[PDB]
Design an enzyme around this catalytic site. Sequence first.
Site, short mmCIF file in Angstrom:
data_model
loop_
_atom_site.label_atom_id
_atom_site.label_comp_id
_atom_site.label_asym_id
_atom_site.label_seq_id
_atom_site.Cartn_x
_atom_site.Cartn_y
_atom_site.Cartn_z
CG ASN A 10 -2.00 -1.01 1.22
OD1 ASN A 10 -1.80 -2.23 1.23
ND2 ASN A 10 -3.24 -0.55 1.20
N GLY A 15 -0.40 11.89 2.68
CA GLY A 15 0.54 12.74 3.40
C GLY A 15 1.95 12.33 3.01
N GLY A 50 10.43 -21.30 -14.88
CA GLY A 50 10.04 -22.18 -13.77
C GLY A 50 9.34 -21.37 -12.68
CE1 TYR A 80 5.32 -3.91 -20.48
CE2 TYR A 80 3.00 -4.34 -19.84
CZ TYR A 80 3.94 -3.88 -20.76
OH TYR A 80 3.46 -3.43 -21.97
N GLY A 121 0.05 -2.43 -23.19
CA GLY A 121 0.43 -1.38 -22.27
C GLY A 121 1.78 -0.75 -22.44
CE1 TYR A 123 6.04 4.18 -19.61
CE2 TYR A 123 8.23 3.40 -20.31
CZ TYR A 123 7.34 3.79 -19.31
OH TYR A 123 7.76 3.81 -17.99
N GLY A 142 1.47 15.27 -7.01
CA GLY A 142 0.25 15.85 -7.56
C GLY A 142 -0.20 15.12 -8.83
CD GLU A 145 -2.71 14.34 -3.99
OE1 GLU A 145 -3.34 15.39 -4.27
OE2 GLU A 145 -1.97 14.20 -3.00
CD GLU A 177 10.51 2.45 -16.41
OE1 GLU A 177 11.56 1.85 -16.19
OE2 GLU A 177 9.91 2.21 -17.44
NE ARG A 180 11.10 -2.16 -15.38
CZ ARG A 180 9.88 -1.78 -15.79
NH1 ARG A 180 9.51 -0.49 -15.88
NH2 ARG A 180 9.01 -2.72 -16.14
CG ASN A 195 4.24 20.09 -3.49
OD1 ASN A 195 3.71 19.01 -3.82
ND2 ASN A 195 3.55 21.21 -3.25
NE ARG A 196 11.92 20.94 -8.44
CZ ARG A 196 11.70 22.10 -7.80
NH1 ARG A 196 10.67 22.93 -8.05
NH2 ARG A 196 12.60 22.44 -6.86
#
Length: 267
Positions: A10, A15, A50, A80, A121, A123, A142, A145, A177, A180, A195-196
């Site tokens: 999760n 926050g 396997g 993936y 799926g 890109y 953001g 979100e 990513e 990875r 908070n870019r």
Amino acid sequence: IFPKQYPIINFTTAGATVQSYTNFIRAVRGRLTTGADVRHEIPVLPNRVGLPINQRFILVELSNHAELSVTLALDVTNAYVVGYRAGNSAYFFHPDNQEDAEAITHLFTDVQNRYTFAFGGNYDRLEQLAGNLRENIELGNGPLEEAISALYYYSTGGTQLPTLARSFIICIQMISEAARFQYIEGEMRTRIRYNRRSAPDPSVITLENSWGRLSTAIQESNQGAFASPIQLQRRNGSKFSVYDVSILIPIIALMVYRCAPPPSSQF
Ligand SMILES: Nc1nc2ncc([C@@H](O)[C@H](O)CO)nc2c(=O)[nH]1
């Protein structure tokens, strides 16, 4: 119960901080790698051959600021994003082969509505759908979100597929990513720290595109040396060439399985 509930990890946009985002990505990585099969210090993802289906998927519960949730399915053998679940429906990208089409049936079986999309799926399909390329899509907390909300509303008609494909791309980068590449978890942490919301740059986009290739070169590197130079891109678009795994050890976090555990080398 279903025969083994796959692990769920999760996360919340609610926050979020650099500490809760690192935690979440460490956990996800710790769920994916075998533990062992460490080629020149990088963990290799388990071979699809396997691998029993009751070990095939990780589920990521993406919660949100307005108590809406989405559960993504992650394929262990390559991290993936194969599909997702929101409310009582489940949607999966179109599989790339029969074996994958087969395995995908063991996912969200308790949902009332299952849908397999007509499109895959990756890109390219997803950028075409989103009508916006990866370097023009913003990342950060953001944007995540916004993505979780979109995926959840797809079930109750606040669909619009450009927005849904855009939301998958955002989610694939900040989750698969980041796992990875230690490098890409670092880009996301900065966007979360300040908070870019910024699009990925050339160094980020080329690592995404070169992961298979990097896994093959590290697994067939002689001693530590790549048998031929791999070029990556700098954050300004300059290409440079990497000749040795040591340069990449703080960059790549995990590799997709390509060759034999060496002879052994772990103990
Ligand atoms: N659904 C979904 N699509 C993806 N498309 C491309 C890539 C890349 O990491 C490839 O390795 C090269 O572009 N990863 C993913 C992914 O995990 N999930």
